[model samples]
Target: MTEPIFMVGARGCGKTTVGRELARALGYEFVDTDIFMQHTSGMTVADVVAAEGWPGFRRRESEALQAVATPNRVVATGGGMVLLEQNRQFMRAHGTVVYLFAPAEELALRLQIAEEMEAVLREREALYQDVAHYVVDATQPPAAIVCELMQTMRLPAA
Candidate 1:
């Protein structure tokens, strides 16, 4: 009831959508790391990635996670959060990490980035496997995904 439950998955995988609903259900603050990073740095994700590269972007991402990983919040992290060992460990240690798994094809339809689906999925699946305490199939409807996660975590029902 006190500790956070961090949502981890690729972009467009319902972190923002599901996170808002999940937070509402639990009465927890919802933090989307990308939005948080932009607010804190005054740089949009695109500009930050362009200016600092993935290295710099991830540095900022890590900082935001650390600053906001408080009790009673739901964090939806940047997809790249899984790229770093330190961040991965931080999530595994700080919260109950829930990996939202969607087939790359399905996710690509939502993002309209079908071309890169396979490659990105290959990489992310491995990273998620190593980090998550719980996993939810994100291809399900958004409400369904949240229900699955809540049930798996033994949280009170809506």
Candidate 2:
């Protein structure tokens, strides 16, 4: 069987959108770590970060990532999840890692934030590159990305 497909990248890179459509294309389930984190914590990512800070959110994120790290599902990972070395290790070991990419300008526009995007990317960009098995130019349409993903990975269940 092909390893699970883990769609990884920064916030505006379309991991969730591509993961959902790809799951549909392959007749599989799709999961976003951020949404899963929210549901599991009974609060939004922002809320968790606000209440407990980045450390708390990272701890919860690690637990969630641990649970979801296995074959068969299409996973859209949270951006900061890559900041943890263990999390990146688990992802690369257990799945096919696709690093979706976009220009900083495009990502910032997609993100609709003024300056935070740069800081976040500056911190985690190398980490995203570290564990990726494939680098995708994701500035194209989501369908185009899905097509490229399907071509690149032998998605067994998909």
Candidate 3:
């Protein structure tokens, strides 16, 4: 059986970049939940938040989590995905959830250096701590962190 993995992290913590590297290293298909949600809903996350508020967005997020949970895909979730108990339960059941953590200062730096950072962090960040299985410091380089995660999980390199 193919066991999937989930990459969880705070906003601006390199979940996307690190998830891609991890997926490539493992030869697994990568699924960014935020991107998937946007594609599935045919709307930007900003629009979702603006139109439906957090509750509505979370409802959709739950649905998305349920849908993704059934497959063995390396998933990179949005920062606040773990706020919902339902989402947490689904992730625990479906895959190994790893939290990519970085110091607040590093996060702040990334947010300031990257474009559209504030908006994304504002929408997420609130739900990061509750659902992580393994917490990886994201202050290191993506490749190094990916290696560390694989080592922790005892996954063979691809």
Candidate 4:
């Protein structure tokens, strides 16, 4: 069987929420890399950033990606995963990549409410465009965007 699809996006882009629903609909396991990193490190992304800066946090993120040894899993990756060329290449080798794009204004608004949002965005944007296979507008509700994505991709119903 092929490796499962991976969702890529900035923070607050609904990757985790939509990825979870999509995985359930497709009967695949949902894996959020951010959550995995947090679980393993015993700290939130914000905490990690505060403690170790972007490079240190990214080191942990890459390690988390390496730990995902299973196929047929919907992986919702952290925004900065694309910042590393190696990470993008590895993910593409393992699965299809879907980019969830939201308007910067909307992202800014959401980020204003998020902890450590500035740091994440500053580090992630440079690498996003290179790896995205499909860019889904994330300004809409998660269900609406998911439906749009499914229709656009002609995804099989589960």
Give the per-residue Cα lDDT of candidate 3 at 85. Answer: 80
Q: Compute the lDDT for candidate 2.
A: 0.83
TM-score for candidate 3, please give it: 0.84
**Regions more than 4 Å wrong, model 3:** 112-129
Best by lDDT: 1
Candidate 3 local lDDT, 25-104, one digit each (tens): 98888888889998888998889999999998899887877677644468888877887788887887777888887655
lDDT tens readout by residue for model 1, 100-135: 888888888785367587788787889987899998
Q: Which segments of candidate 2 are over 4 A away from where they belong? A: 111-114, 156-158
Best of the candidates, TM-score: 1
Off by over 4 Å in 4: 46-52, 111-126
- Each model's lDDT: 0.85, 0.83, 0.78, 0.77
Clashing pairs in 3: none
How do all models score by TM-score?
0.93, 0.90, 0.84, 0.82
Candidate 2 displacement at residue 9 in angstroms: 0.7
Instruction: Give the Å error, residue 130, model 3.
Output: 3.9
lDDT at 74, model 4: 83
- Select the stronger candidate by lDDT from 1 and 2: 1
Which scores higher on lDDT, 1 or 3? 1
Provide the RMSD of all predictions against the true structure, rounded to 1 decimal.
1.5, 1.9, 3.6, 3.2
Clashing pairs in 2: none
Query: How far in Å is the alpha carbon of 25 misplaced in model 3?
Result: 0.4
Residue by residue across 67-150, what tens digits does model 4's lDDT show?
A: 873676788997778888888998778777888876556776764234355556556655665677677887887778778867
Error of 4 at 67 (Å): 1.5
